[PDB]
Design a protein around this ligand. Structure first.
Ligand SMILES: Nc1nc2c(ncn2[C@@H]2O[C@H](COP(=O)(O)OP(=O)(O)O)[C@@H](OP(=O)(O)OP(=O)(O)O)[C@H]2O)c(=O)[nH]1
Ligand SMILES: [Zn+2]
Length: 268
């Protein structure tokens, strides 16, 4: 009996990594049904057969998961944004953060293409990134003069998934891990996923009421709003509006919250 992570799902066979060693397995029990089907990222217990094969007996309860692509137990969602081509957008970033937190994921922020960003713009982006650091995120701003493999290995242990639009620079990182459905590649201290989590933006699962939970500073300062479910829009005695007023929440963050709050409700 062995325990490990699914790094590949190929026509119903599940490659499980156990500290480097690969085993090709098939589900048994409940796990043969679509409704309980294993997914890449799952931690499983399997019985070994035929030296490098096995039967999955148990799939451990998922800590989190994405549906498209289907991938589970992500330890850090790295949101990849370009500084230029296309221009850095707090509007897009904030949205990608809302999605990440709606899936219960640890997020961090990676801005790319520093080498081709005008230096005055670099300075403006660094200030913006400091706001995100204030909220609690780790941020990096990198370009072609940086060692992308040192960057990745210094990230937290476990499963990293990159998320961002085509063109931001994800493959440039991933090509460092390629043996050369989502597939996970090995890194020292974990894995990194071959597909992004959410190149695009899907809010369908999100209720207007949850949006404040996913703006972390609003959630935190919302603690001392008079109303326990204050949405920080028209309510009296609102600590988010107070903190906004005395400069402890950025106006753009509040503006984006409002926009999303109003947008989210609407019909598609
Ligand atoms: N200057 C600079 N460019 C970056 C950086 N990161 C990524 N790029 C470039 O941006 C483009 C998209 O990168 P990918 O790595 O393919 O992005 P993706 O997977 O998110 O879609 C590529 O350029 P391309 O269209 O292939 O043209 P070229 O730049 O290869 O000449 C890539 O080389 C960076 O940090 N600095
Ligand atoms: Zn409030």
């Amino acid at each position: 009996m062995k325990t490990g992570r699914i790094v590949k799902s190929i026509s119903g066979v599940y490659q499980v990594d156990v500290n480097g060693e690969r085993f090709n397995t098939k589900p048994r029990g409940l796990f043969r049904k679509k409704k309980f089907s294993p997914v890449v990222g799952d931690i499983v217990e399997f019985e070994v057969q035929n030296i490098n094969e096995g039967y999955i007996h148990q799939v451990f309860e998922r800590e989190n998961e994405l549906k498209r692509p289907p991938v589970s137990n992500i330890d850090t969602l790295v949101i990849v944004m370009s500084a230029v081509e296309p221009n850095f957008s707090t509007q897009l970033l904030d949205r990608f953060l809302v999605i990440a937190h709606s899936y219960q994921l640890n997020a961090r922020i990676l801005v790319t293409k520093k080498d081709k960003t005008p230096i005055e713009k670099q300075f403006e982006i660094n200030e913006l990134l400091k706001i995100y650091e204030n909220i609690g995120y780790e941020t990096e701003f990198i370009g072609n003069d940086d060692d992308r493999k040192k960057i990745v290995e210094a990230w937290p242990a476990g499963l990293i998934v990159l998320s961002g639009q085509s063109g931001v620079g994800k493959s440039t990182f991933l090509n460092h891990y390629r043996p050369e459905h989502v597939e996970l590649f090995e890194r020292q201290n974990g894995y990194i996923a071959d597909t992004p989590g959410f190149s695009a933006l899907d809010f369908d699962h999100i209720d207007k009421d949850e949006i404040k939970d996913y703006f972390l500073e609003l959630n935190r300062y919302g603690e001392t709003c008079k109303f326990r479910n204050c949405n920080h829009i028209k309510e009296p005695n609102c600590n988010v509006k107070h903190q906004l007023e005395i400069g402890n929440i950025a106006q753009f963050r509040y503006d984006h919250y409002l926009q999303l709050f109003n947008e989210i409700s609407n019909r598609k």
